[PDB]
């Protein structure tokens, strides 16, 4: 039901900021964070891809580090890419939603920067590689002081 929130896009953007922050709480239990992550994935599935970019701005900073619990965000990103690959890549996009601008394009460029970062970030790990390969696969002078005074004067 969250999808179609274009009339009040502010609410969708706000919840997106809060859910990801709450997912990485310092004091948490396994089920408590698991249900929050499932809620975030379900909300992100049925959303407009263009409106997700505001939270994706922080998501594309968090993803390349992959320091803690990156597997669930990696799977969520894989799902979002599988949902909107033809929308974000092809010039026509998808019919109902308007074609995304270059903002999402450079966001995907930063995502591929993260792909560089995580390609050789850590050593071998069976679970890590097994659960991280779908995201990589589905990614596609005094005078100067006087000038300063002049700037201040301006």
């Amino acid at each position: 039901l969250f999808a179609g929130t274009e009339h009040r896009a502010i609410m969708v953007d706000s919840m997106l900021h809060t859910v990801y922050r709450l997912s990485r709480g310092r004091s948490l239990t396994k089920a408590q964070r698991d249900v929050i992550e499932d809620c975030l994935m379900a909300l992100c599935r049925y959303i407009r891809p263009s409106m997700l970019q505001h939270l994706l701005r922080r998501l594309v900073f968090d993803v390349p580090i992959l320091n803690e619990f990156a597997k669930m965000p990696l799977k969520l990103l894989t799902n979002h890419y599988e949902r909107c690959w033809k929308y974000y890549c092809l010039p026509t996009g998808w019919a109902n939603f308007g074609v995304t601008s270059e903002e999402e394009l450079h966001l995907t460029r930063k995502l591929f920067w993260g792909i560089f970062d995580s390609l050789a970030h850590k050593k071998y790990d069976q679970e890590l590689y097994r659960m991280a390969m779908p995201c990589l696969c589905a990614i596609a002078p005094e005078k100067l002081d006087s000038f300063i005074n002049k700037f201040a004067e301006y």
Binding site: S27, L28, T29, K30, A31
Partner: protein
């Protein structure tokens, strides 16, 4: 309930709780309870331990067993589902044969009806090995 969760571990739990309580009156501190849990082998994080203690310094043997049962109930649910996939027949992979379903149902022990078998098949002719079992597991 409590008897149906675990039976053999009661001796180890009683020995650990008796060793933890120096006074012997049956009261164990929260830090002592965590130390006893670590000595048992669970080694659970203190974040869940505090919540379990609050839900259940003055922790006694019955309260300790209630908390241990609450903590240990979760793992058996995950452990039980795995065996059911291959329990139906030797050919666990792609277990869509009617013979495997008949063996699972006619000898289930709960007297599941043939109509109940059809309902389970249609619960969601080919059905994946895990697709119908996940719907049944809920």
């Amino acid at each position: 309930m409590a008897d149906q969760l675990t039976e053999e571990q009661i001796a180890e739990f009683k020995e650990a709780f008796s060793l933890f309580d120096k006074d012997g009156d049956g009261t164990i501190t929260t830090k002592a309870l965590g130390t006893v849990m670590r000595s048992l082998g669970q080694n659970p994080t203190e974040a869940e331990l505090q919540d379990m203690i609050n839900e259940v310094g003055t922790i006694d043997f019955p309260a300790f067993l209630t908390m241990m049962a609450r903590k240990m109930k979760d793992t058996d649910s995950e452990e039980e589902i795995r065996e059911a996939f291959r329990v139906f027949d030797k050919d666990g992979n792609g277990y869509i044969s009617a013979a495997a379903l008949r063996h699972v149902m006619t000898n289930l022990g709960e007297k599941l009806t043939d109509e109940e078998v059809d309902e389970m098949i249609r619960e969601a002719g080919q059905v994946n090995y895990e697709a119908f079992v996940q719907m049944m597991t809920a």
